[PDB]
Every structure is written in C-alpha cells, then in structure tokens.
Design a protein around this ligand. Structure first.
Ligand SMILES: [Cl-]
Lengths: 262, 258
C-alpha cells in the first residue's frame, strides 16, 4: 500500500507541482524502516511533462521498496526558460523530502534522482552543479537541505548543442546560460554515481547525449554503469528475468551494488 | 559432447596455433543442424594469450549451441609486430573453418568473432578491414574465403593512442602502420554487428575505447549494443552470470542464434 500526496511547492518565485507516493510500512506499530526514495524528473522535451513511460517506472521502482516523488520541473511554456529555475526546484524538492523524512520514513542517505529525456538534462546538470560548492552558490542551491546519493538516466538529453533541440533559438529558450548547455562539461570527481541507459536506435533523443555524459564520468572515474540496448524494444514503456523489461532489473541490481537498496 | 582439435596453421610465413572445439551431433528426431561457431581472440596485452576469462566464456557459449575455435594470434614476442600478421591469421582461420564446415556441421553464415582486451583490438580492426574490398587487398586477405556475421568485444583495446600502450615505442612495436591504431576509424556501414561489454571485475584499458567503437558503429548505422556494468563478489559473481544472457539475447535478435 501507499499514500498519494499532491502538492504545489514554490521556490525562486517559480511554483511547481509534485506528487509524492509514500510507501506504507509493513505495520503502523513497528519501528519504522526508512525506505530509499527516487525523485523522477519526467521527459517531455521541455514543453510538457511526460507520464507514459514514467508512471510504469514509478510503479516498478516502488515494488522494489522505495518511495517515489515526481517533480514537474519548469518548462518553456508561456515564454519562460527552464533554468536556473529547474535546478532550484529540484533542490527545493530534495529539501521538502527531508522535511517529510520522519512523517513518511524516508532514508535521506538514499535519495536517488532519475531523469528521462529532458528530465535527464535537469538531473545530469544537477548532478554536476549540486556537487560543486562554487556552482551551488552561483545557482543558489546552498539555501536547501539534503543531497542525492546517485542518479539514474534514461535516454537523457545531456548536451543542448548535440541535436536536441533542433535550433539555436530553441536552445536559448531553454536557457541563455551557456554553462548549463552541456551537462557532461560539469562532471567532476564529486559527481554522484550514475546508471545510464538508452537505446541504440533512439530517434527522439540522439544517443550521442548519453555517450557524452558517460565519457565524462569515466574520465573523472566516477562510479558509472551504462547500457546501450541494441533493440528499441528495451526502451518501450513498462508493463535476469526473461519475462520482464531488462533495464529496471539492471538498475535495481546496480542500486544494490551501490548500497542504496536492500 | 565435443571433440577437441589442436592445430598449428601457417599463413604469411607467420605460424599460429588454434584449438577447435567441435560440438557433437546428437542422434535424434530433430532436423539436421549446422551450428554457429565463435572464434575467440584472447586477451593478454599482445605479450601473452590469456585463458583465465576466455575458457569459461567458451564453455558458456558452447552450451548455447555453438562450436568454438581459439586463435592464438601474433604476439610481439621475439621482437615481432602484431600486424598485419594477426589480421591475416584471423582471415586464414575463417578460411580454414570453411574447409572444415561439412565435416563438423558448421553454419558459415553464423561465424561470430569474439575479442577480449588486446584480442578485441584484433577483432575490432578485422571487422573494419575485412569488410572493405580495398583494405582486404591492402592487407592480403583477398586470398581467404569466408566471412564473419558479427562480433563480440569484451573490454576491448580499440585505439592504441587512448591509454594503452603507455609508450610510443610500445605502440610502434604492435604496429608502425598508424592506419591500424584506431579501430573506430575503420568502421563503415559494411562493418558487421557488434555486442560490447565489460564488468566491474574486468581489468583492461579505459572504457572510452569501447565508447569510441560503439559511437562509430552508431554513426554508420550498424547494429550495436554496449553493456558497461562498471569500470573497476556475490554481486561481481552475478555480473559474470548476467552479461552472457544479454549477449545471447542480442545474438538471437541478430538471427545468429535460436
Ligand atoms: Cl505523456
């Protein structure tokens, strides 16, 4: 069982919506077991918030014994830019989770960020910025509590010059802050570990994006797994076990290896 | 059941050893089967031929229904170069397999090359050279019959300037033919499909080697997959059990197996 909580949060005068899915305890009368938590930054190419792939992933991750929160980060809608706002909102969401840690029994040493497509850009960029003191200051992230332990990236947008979006006017709408264009360029040995996956045949998000982030992580010897699946079927929305999608099985095992999951 | 055959073969005045592991036919009421075959180019940094990881891998793969041959390609031993000799030996080994195909029931439309570390350089370079008639001529492969359908690469050496060897004298010893240094640069749409992987327990070069090959394959629209579990034991044991499942699935997706 789970409790669903919808909220509208606000930071930096850019309100945003989240849904929390709080996993129930085995008993209300037992000493609490603090569960890890995954914060999901959806896809949607910075114009919408994808749910199609994200909802099944949330379900699967929870069945493994985790809480999940979906973060509907700033979009370009209504002639806005995404940054720096999305980074502040992700920071504010992590902070909010910490404030809920006793109420819903959240292990705040085991906060995992997961980003898909455009959300992958937000997460990957966060992973860089939030782990460098100078950049936290610059993007005002030192106002927030809590930190992530690791990230998961599925078909992430990583470099806004690498094919998505298709035009420079679109890139500059997302942000004119060129420092945030290329998330791989913000990787340092301080970046938290990452599990990255994509399909080789991806015609929506150019695969060069994940190759770029993985290169940089490996260059700085950050703990990293990367799975580029041969067939597009492995990237389809969810419904080794031959009867279930491969990638969640790999990600879960990786989280176990990283000490982030029982 | 299998039969083991040891041979010392010779091409280009550079002898080389192979061992072939020929899967037995079963007497049954299933239709005749010619089995695929995997040719293993071992690791060993061009100074030895590794068996420690290769042996159980050969064993796992044969259990999926394939023959295997192990090719002890040219090393730098005795003040020698690796190339072009290793490519010619691999070509010769494939030719040899075609001549043995009726005797052992080998599906020569399903020859799979598997290269580990330094042997990954041989296999990756071969996938590029042997699929281009002009480079076939240049490296005297025009002479040999048979062609591989796909390759597997474990933790491969791909670009002899991307970390290993650590010295120019070393690189030159492997080969002074700089066209052969960077296998990714020889990828074309004619290159065969490639499955690449590495587990955390694997000791090899920086994985940017693998990434560079895989990107080249993507750029030329050749089927490829890449499974990096980590770069550097219940969990490590498990990775060893998991990657072959992915390899075998991929081989099935490619029509190369069951
Ligand atoms: Cl959607």
């Amino acid at each position: 069982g789970m409790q669903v909580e919808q909220r509208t949060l606000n930071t930096a005068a850019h309100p945003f919506q989240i849904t929390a899915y709080w996993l129930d305890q085995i008993s209300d009368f037992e000493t609490a077991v603090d569960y890890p938590i995954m914060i999901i930054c959806p896809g949607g190419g910075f114009t919408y918030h994808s749910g199609r792939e994200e909802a099944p992933i949330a379900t699967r991750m929870m069945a493994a014994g985790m809480h999940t929160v979906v973060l509907n980060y700033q979009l370009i809608v209504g002639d806005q830019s995404v940054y720096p706002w999305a980074l502040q909102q992700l920071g504010a969401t992590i902070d909010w989770i910490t404030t809920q840690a006793s109420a819903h029994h959240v292990d705040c040493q085991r906060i995992i960020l997961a980003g898909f497509s455009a959300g992958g850009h937000v997460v990957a960029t966060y992973n860089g910025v939030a782990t460098q003191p100078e950049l936290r200051t610059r993007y005002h992230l030192d106002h927030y509590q809590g930190q992530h332990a690791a990230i998961i990236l599925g078909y992430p947008v990583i470099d806004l010059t690498a094919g998505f979006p298709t035009t420079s006017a679109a890139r500059n709408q997302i942000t004119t802050d060129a420092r945030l264009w290329a998330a791989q360029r913000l990787v340092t040995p301080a970046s938290k570990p990452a599990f990255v996956w994509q399909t080789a045949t991806d015609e929506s998000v150019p695969p060069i994006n994940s190759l770029k982030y993985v290169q940089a992580m490996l260059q700085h010897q950050v703990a990293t797994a990367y799975h580029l699946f041969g067939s597009g079927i492995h990237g389809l929305a969810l419904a080794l076990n031959d009867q279930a999608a491969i990638w969640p099985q790999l990600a879960l095992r990786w989280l176990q290896e990283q000490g982030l999951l029982a």
